[PDB]
Every structure is written in structure tokens, then in C-alpha cells.
Design an enzyme around this catalytic site. Structure first.
Site, PDB file in Angstrom:
ATOM      1  N   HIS A 102      -5.316   9.330  -2.003  1.00 57.89           N
ATOM      2  CA  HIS A 102      -4.851   9.811  -0.679  1.00 57.89           C
ATOM      3  C   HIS A 102      -3.521  10.457  -0.727  1.00 57.89           C
ATOM      4  O   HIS A 102      -2.943  10.975  -1.594  1.00 57.89           O
ATOM      5  CB  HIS A 102      -4.338   8.044  -0.343  1.00 57.89           C
ATOM      6  CG  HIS A 102      -3.187   7.614  -1.058  1.00 57.89           C
ATOM      7  ND1 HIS A 102      -1.855   7.896  -0.857  1.00 57.89           N
ATOM      8  CD2 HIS A 102      -3.147   6.726  -2.127  1.00 57.89           C
ATOM      9  CE1 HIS A 102      -1.175   7.213  -1.705  1.00 57.89           C
ATOM     10  NE2 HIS A 102      -1.842   6.692  -2.661  1.00 57.89           N
ATOM     11  N   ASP A 120       2.527   9.656  -5.861  1.00 55.26           N
ATOM     12  CA  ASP A 120       1.779   8.882  -5.197  1.00 55.26           C
ATOM     13  C   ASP A 120       1.390   9.275  -3.887  1.00 55.26           C
ATOM     14  O   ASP A 120       2.379   9.231  -2.950  1.00 55.26           O
ATOM     15  CB  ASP A 120       2.164   7.481  -5.138  1.00 55.26           C
ATOM     16  CG  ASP A 120       1.267   6.078  -4.722  1.00 55.26           C
ATOM     17  OD1 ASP A 120       0.107   6.562  -4.600  1.00 55.26           O
ATOM     18  OD2 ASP A 120       1.400   5.219  -4.695  1.00 55.26           O
ATOM     19  N   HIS A 139       7.531   5.057  -5.735  1.00 56.55           N
ATOM     20  CA  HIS A 139       8.014   5.045  -4.743  1.00 56.55           C
ATOM     21  C   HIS A 139       9.305   5.111  -4.712  1.00 56.55           C
ATOM     22  O   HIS A 139      10.060   4.503  -3.922  1.00 56.55           O
ATOM     23  CB  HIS A 139       7.958   3.363  -4.104  1.00 56.55           C
ATOM     24  CG  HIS A 139       6.370   3.278  -3.394  1.00 56.55           C
ATOM     25  ND1 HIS A 139       5.712   1.939  -3.647  1.00 56.55           N
ATOM     26  CD2 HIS A 139       5.339   4.109  -3.525  1.00 56.55           C
ATOM     27  CE1 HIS A 139       4.546   2.052  -3.243  1.00 56.55           C
ATOM     28  NE2 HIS A 139       4.248   3.210  -2.998  1.00 56.55           N
ATOM     29  N   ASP A 156      -5.429   6.550  -8.407  1.00 53.99           N
ATOM     30  CA  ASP A 156      -4.246   6.502  -7.808  1.00 53.99           C
ATOM     31  C   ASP A 156      -3.304   6.266  -8.682  1.00 53.99           C
ATOM     32  O   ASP A 156      -3.714   6.505  -9.982  1.00 53.99           O
ATOM     33  CB  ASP A 156      -4.439   5.337  -7.260  1.00 53.99           C
ATOM     34  CG  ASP A 156      -3.415   4.945  -5.862  1.00 53.99           C
ATOM     35  OD1 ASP A 156      -2.227   5.304  -5.820  1.00 53.99           O
ATOM     36  OD2 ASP A 156      -4.079   4.401  -4.925  1.00 53.99           O
ATOM     37  N   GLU A 198      -3.093   5.643   3.223  1.00 53.45           N
ATOM     38  CA  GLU A 198      -3.254   4.272   2.031  1.00 53.45           C
ATOM     39  C   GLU A 198      -2.019   3.430   1.897  1.00 53.45           C
ATOM     40  O   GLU A 198      -2.055   2.058   1.707  1.00 53.45           O
ATOM     41  CB  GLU A 198      -3.635   5.088   0.880  1.00 53.45           C
ATOM     42  CG  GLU A 198      -4.113   4.068  -0.431  1.00 53.45           C
ATOM     43  CD  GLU A 198      -2.928   3.777  -1.265  1.00 53.45           C
ATOM     44  OE1 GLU A 198      -1.778   4.144  -0.892  1.00 53.45           O
ATOM     45  OE2 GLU A 198      -3.268   2.925  -2.285  1.00 53.45           O
ATOM     46  N   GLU A 199      -0.888   4.096   2.005  1.00 58.16           N
ATOM     47  CA  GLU A 199       0.506   3.408   1.800  1.00 58.16           C
ATOM     48  C   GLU A 199       0.415   2.298   2.988  1.00 58.16           C
ATOM     49  O   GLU A 199       1.374   1.374   2.732  1.00 58.16           O
ATOM     50  CB  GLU A 199       1.674   4.381   1.682  1.00 58.16           C
ATOM     51  CG  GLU A 199       1.433   5.546   0.872  1.00 58.16           C
ATOM     52  CD  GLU A 199       1.776   4.731  -0.649  1.00 58.16           C
ATOM     53  OE1 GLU A 199       1.767   3.669  -0.976  1.00 58.16           O
ATOM     54  OE2 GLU A 199       2.230   5.789  -1.488  1.00 58.16           O
TER      55      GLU A 199
END
Lengths: 361, 361, 361
Positions: free
Chosen positions: C67, C177, C322, C230, C207-208
């Protein structure tokens, strides 16, 4: 058999009961012991003991500092019950006071033992009590009987503990801070063969009450480079992570990079810090780096004197500081004196100049 | 295009990593920049940079002060994991440390980036962690690999942020306190056409650790009237009432009436305060009154020097002080330099006498 | 010197600011880079980039997924003060937002830096604030001045951090990510020498925000066997037990057995899982088993497509996922591409049949 010589000197000094402002018993002796090794010697206004060695050069002035005072308690009120109430001298914490035996001294000369007691369990929660709930028991039934004992409000009390040996390398007593550093200073004074630079050896007063004696003593002497000798925290006990030990017993004196209060107590003059390290290293004296987040020594206010004083600290590792139960490792004291002796011996009038800085213009 | 000249000077100084006690990188440059504009110039014991302008009169002495040091972190322990533990330098708060990128410098020269990490969420409550639970990640798997990187205990770390522009008037960086005030001082030094009175320009050390450099620097110079330049809090952010803003960005430098600690940090000498205001006013420089209940600057201990030193503060408004993210308004800096230039220019040997007071007899 | 090639590709992709729904900047580039190595290539409805390699056989279809989108913030309100309020895109947590620098982009093209600030300490408790109490500071004094900057409600903000190197093997940035997994996918695309089976290379969107792009992209392609790439959690930081690490940096990509939500995110098709392992093993690629109790990847909804799609995940270990501060180990990325290349190369039309199951009758 140096070990025995240290212990006996320490027993002499730690059996002397001299909390801040009251240091006269220690003050006397230190003068005595200091006397032969010094050129000039005196006791100033506040009772600082100042020894002086003129060495061989026109050179400069280096000062060495250790405090005589220990934490203790002022008897504040005397109950009709005959019990005594106290307020603390310096950094005393209540955990150290519970079911402890104490020595009270007598505005004139004398020494009575006392016991720090508590309400009994039935008055569920423990809960270290508060100082105002503590009392000292000297065995009297009245205020009258107390006065008759010669003890008055203002009389100081101190932990009743004398040196004991823990195995071969370590020892316990009250008042290691700083008598242990006086000892180290004094015993480096003996090992001293002369030197280029003038040496002031100073045993100070009222440090636990926040560096008062070291502030004033240094003002009149004002030297180029000062050295503090104090104890420093060693947490290498159980239930503490190796990151929070800060020092280890038996790993050598701790050359101080930083201490206290979001730093702010002292960040030692790097050039004196650098000096101490390279000396220790080349002389293969074991040492530690003191980087700490709490506590401070004499050097905090010394480095603040006048135009400034290049200052550093040799600190000796101590467990359970500010208790009756403090622990010190005799090797740390031996190497402490060595690193002190060297510092003075290896000091030179030329090195003392970097240190005061250029003049670019 | 003055704006650009300020920014570039600030980038130069704020990309220099010099937390308290370590200020040498900044210390070097400041000397360089200060050199042409001064008559006499030197670096003292503690590393204070002191410039000197003799002006035209027998006059007197006025001093201007700004600190070079910034908050930062000492690496204290090095894990076997390879991670680093830290203790703070000065007024560092943990909220500012979370998920922040940091630069560590190398007891000798070098610079490695690092990352301040946390336990993950699964070990419900947030709960800003505590410093002892924080660690720095430099990308190493061992203590060995760390040592091999040249980084030792005692090495300092500092926020990794470089100046960025927020719109036309404002900018972000780490270490605005006080590099922003050095800048202001330095750039008033350029604008300076001569003056009656002797001017000492001083870039000081170890202020975040509580005003140490400003204490000693001033002792040897001792001037009649001193001026501090520091940042001051601006709360004009959202969720704060207009009564608690204390200053606003872009509203001009803040002439200090009072700061800190139930007052007690400094209540500035009213006559220097009065002076600064009337000057600004008559010269139509925009300004603010700094009346604050927290924080303090160099002038706290300067005004305490010897018989006393008439002292005041020009403070520049800053948002989010002591973060990587501090914000400053360039107009506040411009008018800051103007109000400084004026103060020195408008100072006279006669005015310097009120100030030391009568003799009634 | 592969290391440098990875870093530069990653800098290219992670300096692109493309949070979920906004991925166009990355979307463009990925197409560019993908173009030469593919037979057919296109961007679908939702902006998925789809490359196609026909290999040599009648064979079958295998899909590879990564992603493009990153977490970020929508500016939601614009204060009259000039400050901006935000709501999160994806799995953003407030600890990562405090005293962070941010980049806002401009409904048309442009990029302004901003600062995420807080109420000051005086408004005892910290207490990570709440998003509604946070605000972004772009240096403006009004809503008018903001609009005039071209920034409107709906404009996205993103962490301002660019790649930095942590030692030799590791690196920091925002948006690892999944840009790290795009990179891995893209760079396995280069190493690719042909193969029996048709390969669809897909760089997905949103995707998130819960696997939206991977759901739709796969529907039209429908392949036999899909592969997600991922990041996955690595807790091998301090203060965490070795049982909760889940992966280690530099120990190789993590072949996924299970992830999330009392399982329930994905329990990967064992036959694809088995395949990946035996390949890695025989090809002596280092690898880890991803068995995790939180988080999920594209493969959750891919394996759910139509009659079902045999699906697995190559995940790359990442610390502090994140955050602006995420850390990745370049070896994990290298071996990631190798294990991807192999999987496609070693895939055969015959093996693709087990997988769809008998017919006992």
C-alpha cells in the site's frame, strides 16, 4: 596493612558527633591531624579548618575540600512526658529514623543514648510515619528529669552506630558523608611529597545544609582550581537496574561529570575533569564517571566563586547514603587518596593556564 | 532583506549543538562574529565570550548578556542491547521527548542521529512515560557496537531539528532559547555607532542549569548597569485565556517588570525598566511588558552582583519553549536589536547616576 | 552498494506526502518506476497501480500487494486565531503528535510546515492530551491569512521527517508503512527473470483506513495466489520481554502465520505459508515467523476474495510503527525482495494446484 590505618582513622572521625553547625568535635581533631603536614594552618570564622602547603614554584593555588558536618536532629520540644521532639538537620528522611538508636549531646559536654519510637500498630496501614509523630525516648519521666540531665532544646542528636566491618573490603557506619572524604583528604596529605603549586587543604562546615562553609571558605583563598571530595550514590543493590546504579562499590572513585537537579548542581569544568581522568588512567588508578541526576557537593558553589574557579569532584561510592547504615568500600578510599595525591603532584603552573582563556582581542 | 540575514545567522547558531557545559561549538563562532566590532575580546575561565567596546567619555560600564547553552540530554548508561539511557540537562520535560529524533555527539567530533522510543502500547493508560523508561536508538545491536561508534557515557544529545519557516514572519527550531538572544545581541552589535559608555557584550554559558555563567562573568567586569536578553513565554495559543498569554508573537520585545517564583527571580530595577520603556516609546519601537509567574533569566543573579547592578531584561516572545518545536517571530527579533542598540546609544554617564543613590547624611 | 540504491528509492518515496485517499504523488512515481519491467500497466478506478508480467506457461495468476498510503491528519477546522484543528487518518495515536513538526499540503500544489502544539503546563498532570486539544501552528494570525496561504479544510498534514541513517544497517523516517513494502516489491520487480506464471504487481490505496484498495483491486484481477508485503511490529526495544518482541530488526522478513484481533485478521493459507518457508530455507534466506496478536495487512481481505485466494504475507520488521520515528533494517528489506523474487520465480502452474482441493465425489 593500610586497610587498618584507614579504619582506625574513620572510627576516630565517625565516633565524633558533629552535625551541621556543631562540627567542633571533628573540627578539633582535624586540625591536630593536619598540623605536621602543613606550612600554615588555621580555623576561619565559620570553623573551617584550612591547611596550607607552599610547594616549589611561584605557581598558583589549588584547593581541596571536604565537609566535616553530618545530618542529624535538633531536639525542638521537650514533652512533659519527658519525650523529645525533633526537626531535621539536612537531608534526613523518615525511613531511616524508625526504631533507631540515637546519641544526644548536651549543650555542655555529655552524651545520652536515646530511642526513636513510634505509635504502636494499634492506633492496618504502614505508612512510614511523619517526623512530627516521632519522639525520642531517653528514659526520663518528666521535662524536669530531662533538664536535670542537662539536655536542652537545641541539643543535637545523631545516629548511634560505630564502624563495623562487612567482609574484607567494606564497612558500615553513620556519617560516612563526608567524614570518609575528610579521611581521604587527610590521608592524601600524608602521601604528599612536594609539588609546584600551592595547596590549600580545607575541611569545611555546614554542607548538608547546602554548601555554606565551602562558599565562604573559598572566597578568601581564592584559588585557581578547586577539588571537592564527597560521597556519591551507589545503587548497585538488588531490585535496581544496572542503568540506575550510577556507581559500584569497589570500582574506584568517581570523577564527576555532572550531578543533581536537571544538571544544575555542578557540571564540572571539563578541563579539570579531563585532567583527572588522564591522570588516573596513565597512573592506572581505577575510576568511575559520576553522571548523576540527584544530589550535589561543595564544588557546586566553589565553581561559582568570583570570576569562577575551575572545579571538579572526586566522589567515593556509598550505599544507603544518609542512613545509620551507609556502606563504603575501602579500595575506593585508597584509590581516592591516590588520585588526589596525583592531582596535586601532577598539577603545574603552566597547566593551570588554559583555564582563563585566550584573550583574542 | 534583513529577514534573510537573521534567518541565516540563526541557522548557523541553532545547527550548532551546544547544551550547557558543552557550548564550545557556539562559543567558537560567536567569537568570530563578534571580533570586528569590538575593541577588546576574550573567552574567560568558564568559556564566556566577552567583547568590549570603549565608547567616547570617561563614562561608565554597561553589560549585555545572552546565553549560548541549550537544554539537552546526557547519555548516562549504555545497554547491552545497544540502547542509551539519559538524564536531562536543564529544564527538559518528557512530553517533548516522545517519538523525537535526536543528535548525539561523540566525545571527540562526530554526530550520530538517534531516536527516542517507548514501550509499545501493549505492556489502556497514556500517561506520558518517565525518563527512566525512555531510551535512545542509534541503530546498534550492542554496547560494543556503540563504543565502536565512538559514543561514550557523558556524550550529549540534542533535538534534531533545523530552522523551518512558518509563513512570512515566523520560524521553528530547537534551541531558540537563547541562541535567538545571542543573535539579537550580535546583530545590535553591528548596528552600533559609538556611544558615551563602555559596552561589554557577553555570550554566556550554563544558564539553563541556573544562571551559572552569568554569575561569574559579571563579577570580574563589574558594570553599573546590565542587560539580559532571553526568551520569554508566549501562551497566545488556543485553549488559553487572554489573561494567561503573557506575551504575543509579533507584538514586540518584552521589557521585564517581574518574573518567576512568587516574583523572586527578578523584579527588574525600575529605573532601567523605566528607561527601556521611554526609549522604546519615543523611538516608536513596539514593545510588551513582561510580567510573569514562572521562569527566570540571567538578570536574576546579575542584579545580585556585589553592591548590586541595575539590571533589566529584553525578552523575545517564544511559543513552546524548551521543545524541538519552539516558535519565534522575526519582527520581535528585529525590534529587539533596535531596542538594544538604542539602550546602549542612549545611555549616558550622567543617567548612570541616579542609580547609586543620594547620600543624605 | 545495493544499500545506497534502497535508501535513495526510499527517500524518493517517503518524501512524498500521500496519506490515505490522497496517494497521487506516490501513485505517479510508482507507475514511472514500474513501467519498463512490466508487460501491461494501468491505474484503476481507486488509483491502484497495476503492473502485469506474463511469464512463460499458460500457468496461472499470482498477485503481489503493497500500500502507498500513510497515516496523516485532515485539517478539520480553521480557527480565527489562525490555528488548525485536525482529525486522524488511520491508526494515528496522540503520543506521536506532541511537539512534532508537520507538513501541510495545499489543495492545489504547495507545502507549508506546521507545528503541533499544546496548552502549556500551567492550565500537575501529564496526561497525553487529546486530539481535540491539539492544534497546528503554521505561523498565521488569522483565518484570512490561512486562506490566503491556500490551505483549506480537507487539506492533509503529514509528519515532517526525511530519512536519516542510524548506523550502517538501519534507518529512520515517517511512512515506512508501507512505502518500505512498495520499495521491496519494486526492487524485486527488477531482479525478476521470467517465470511460468503471470504476475500482477499492485501498489494499493487506503490500507491504513482498513484495506479498502486491496479489496477492490483484487476483485477484477482475481488471481489464484496473492502476496501481501507490509510492515510488522518489532518490540525488541528495552523494557519488553523477549516473548513480546514478536520480531527482531535484522533477523529477516517475517513470513506470516497469524495476525490481529484474536486471530481473525488473517491466518495465512498454510500451503502458501509452507511454500514461503521451504523456499527461504532452501535458498538460505534468513526469515522470521510472524505470529502476532495485533494489526493486520492487505491479505486479510484478499484471502476473502470471491471463492477465496490463497494468501500470505512477507512482512518487514519495524520499530515504533506509526510514528515519525519508525526504524527499519535494510537487510530485512534486501532479503525481503529476495524472498519475493524467489516466490514468483519458484511458483509453478502445477503447484498452484493443490490449493482448490481434490473433488472427492
Amino acid at each position: 596493612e593500610w586497610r587498618g590505618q584507614y579504619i582506625e582513622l574513620i572510627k576516630k572521625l565517625t565516633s565524633l558527633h558533629a552535625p551541621s553547625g556543631r562540627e567542633d568535635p571533628v573540627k578539633d581533631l582535624v586540625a591536630e591531624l593536619m598540623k605536621s603536614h602543613v606550612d600554615k594552618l588555621w580555623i576561619d570564622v565559620w570553623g573551617n579548618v584550612v591547611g596550607y602547603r607552599k610547594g616549589s614554584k611561584g605557581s598558583g593555588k589549588i584547593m581541596i575540600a571536604a565537609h566535616m558536618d553530618e545530618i542529624g536532629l535538633f531536639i525542638s520540644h521537650i514533652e512533659d512526658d519527658g519525650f523529645l521532639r525533633v526537626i531535621p538537620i539536612g537531608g534526613v528522611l523518615e525511613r531511616t529514623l524508625l526504631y533507631q538508636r540515637v546519641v544526644v549531646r548536651t549543650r555542655d559536654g555529655r552524651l545520652y543514648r536515646g530511642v526513636i519510637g513510634l505509635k504502636p500498630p494499634h492506633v492496618e496501614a504502614q505508612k512510614v510515619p511523619e517526623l512530627r509523630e516521632l519522639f525520642i525516648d531517653v528514659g526520663a519521666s518528666s521535662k524536669e528529669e530531662v533538664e536535670k540531665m542537662g539536655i536542652r532544646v537545641g541539643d543535637i542528636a545523631v545516629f548511634d552506630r560505630e564502624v563495623a566491618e562487612l567482609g574484607w573490603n567494606r564497612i558500615t557506619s553513620k556519617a560516612f558523608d563526608d567524614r570518609v572524604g575528610v579521611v581521604v583528604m587527610l590521608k592524601a596529605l600524608e602521601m604528599l611529597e612536594k609539588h609546584d603549586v600551592d595547596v590549600y587543604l580545607v575541611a569545611t562546615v555546614q554542607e548538608e545544609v547546602g554548601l555554606k562553609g565551602a562558599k565562604t571558605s573559598a572566597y578568601g583563598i581564592s584559588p585557581d582550581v578547586a577539588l571537592a571530595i564527597d560521597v556519591t550514590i551507589a545503587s548497585d543493590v538488588p531490585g535496581v537496574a544496572k542503568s540506575e546504579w550510577f556507581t559500584r562499590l569497589g570500582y574506584g572513585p568517581a570523577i564527576k561529570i555532572v550531578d543533581g537537579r536537571n544538571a544544575g548542581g555542578l557540571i564540572a569544568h571539563p578541563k579539570v575533569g579531563e585532567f583527572l581522568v588522564s591522570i588516573a588512567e596513565k597512573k592506572r588508578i581505577p575510576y568511575q564517571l559520576d553522571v548523576i541526576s540527584g544530589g550535589t557537593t561543595d564544588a557546586s558553589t566553589i565553581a561559582l566563586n568570583k570570576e569562577g574557579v575551575a572545579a571538579g569532584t572526586i566522589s567515593i561510592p556509598s550505599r544507603y547514603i544518609h542512613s545509620p547504615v551507609e556502606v563504603v568500600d575501602l579500595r575506593d578510599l585508597y584509590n581516592a587518596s591516590l588520585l588526589a595525591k596525583a592531582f596535586i603532584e601532577e598539577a603545574t603552573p603552566e597547566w593551570i593556564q588554559s583555564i582563563k582563556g585566550v584573550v583574542i582581542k
